[PDB]
């Protein structure tokens, strides 16, 4: 089990996503199921540590947003081209 | 000192293209498109010339549209 804390993104696009990656964060999206897709943003160093395990990309993860846990799986991740960093993560609702 | 070349040639620009665009009122006989092949095709009230030139047979607005199973591009004149 991996428990990740998130916040709903108040704004999207290039300037916001660049500005989160400036402030040590990165966006992600939870989609799948019948629920509408949810645009979250994460702390980078926590998830970068958590993703080093294959358990991360195999198990079911719990995402806490507004105190509401969502059990997901890591569908796809966009990485930085030459730096050990994360751009964006897809989460499918398990 | 020395050298030469074999690649000096080129031809004159034939000024093809679309002379009147969509929603653009024309007179009868006005050239709409000059083109080599039938990159476009003649629809309603539009004739195709000897060199695949698309001209208006009547007066009105140009209508671009995609029809047919092959998704070919047709040019038609709406009435006006």
């Amino acid at each position: 089990m991996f428990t990740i804390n998130a916040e709903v993104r108040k704004e999207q696009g290039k300037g916001a996503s660049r500005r989160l990656r400036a402030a040590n964060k990165f966006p992600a999206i939870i989609y799948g199921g019948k629920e509408a897709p949810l645009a979250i943003e994460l702390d980078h160093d926590k998830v970068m540590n958590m993703q080093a395990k294959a358990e991360f990309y195999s198990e079911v993860l719990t995402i806490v947003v507004d105190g509401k846990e969502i059990k997901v799986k890591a569908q796809d991740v966009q990485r930085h081209p030459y730096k050990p960093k994360l751009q964006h993560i897809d989460f499918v609702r398990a | 000192a020395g050298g030469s070349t074999r690649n000096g040639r080129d031809s004159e620009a034939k000024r093809l293209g679309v002379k009147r665009f969509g929603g653009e009122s024309v007179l009868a006989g006005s050239i709409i498109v000059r083109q080599r092949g039938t990159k476009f095709h003649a629809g309603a009230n539009v004739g195709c010339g000897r060199d695949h030139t698309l001209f208006a047979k009547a007066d009105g607005k140009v209508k671009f549209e995609v029809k047919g199973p092959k998704n070919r591009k047709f040019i038609s004149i709406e009435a006006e």
Partner: protein, 136 residues
């Protein structure tokens, strides 16, 4: 020395080398040598770094080369004025963007791949780094 057998055309424009790369992840092998900088390599630089890691592994394991030099580079001869046609094709390069994985390797330990890719990156003009395979 890598070189295309046939080409549709003998010469090519100089172009540019802007943008990010596509061959980013370690596809085939386990360890990779990823380019961080930007530039153009050659068949000599590629073959010299291949020799340095083949010898550093004592031909143990398997080495992939992800890049290939397909761009011809012309030069004009000495004491030739700037006109009178394009210069003669002299050598072949591969345009390298940041993020391009240059080489891959497996069948060896990690530390041996580190020291082999370090001996190879010492033969390369651009700045490189060491990468490993990743699930997803």
């Amino acid at each position: 020395m890598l070189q295309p057998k046939r080409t549709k055309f003998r010469k090519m424009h100089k172009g540019r080398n802007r943008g990010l790369a596509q061959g980013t992840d370690v596809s085939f092998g386990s360890f990779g040598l990823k380019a961080v900088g930007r530039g153009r390599l050659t068949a000599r630089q590629i073959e010299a770094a291949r020799r340095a890691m083949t010898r550093a592994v004592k031909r143990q394991g398997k080495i992939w080369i992800r890049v290939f030099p397909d761009k011809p580079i012309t030069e004009k001869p000495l004491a030739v004025r700037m006109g009178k046609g394009k210069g003669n094709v002299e050598y072949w390069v591969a345009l390298i963007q940041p993020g391009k994985v240059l080489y891959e390797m497996d069948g060896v330990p990690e530390e041996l791949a580190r020291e082999a890719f370090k001996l190879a990156a010492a033969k390369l003009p651009i700045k490189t780094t060491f990468v490993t395979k990743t699930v997803m």
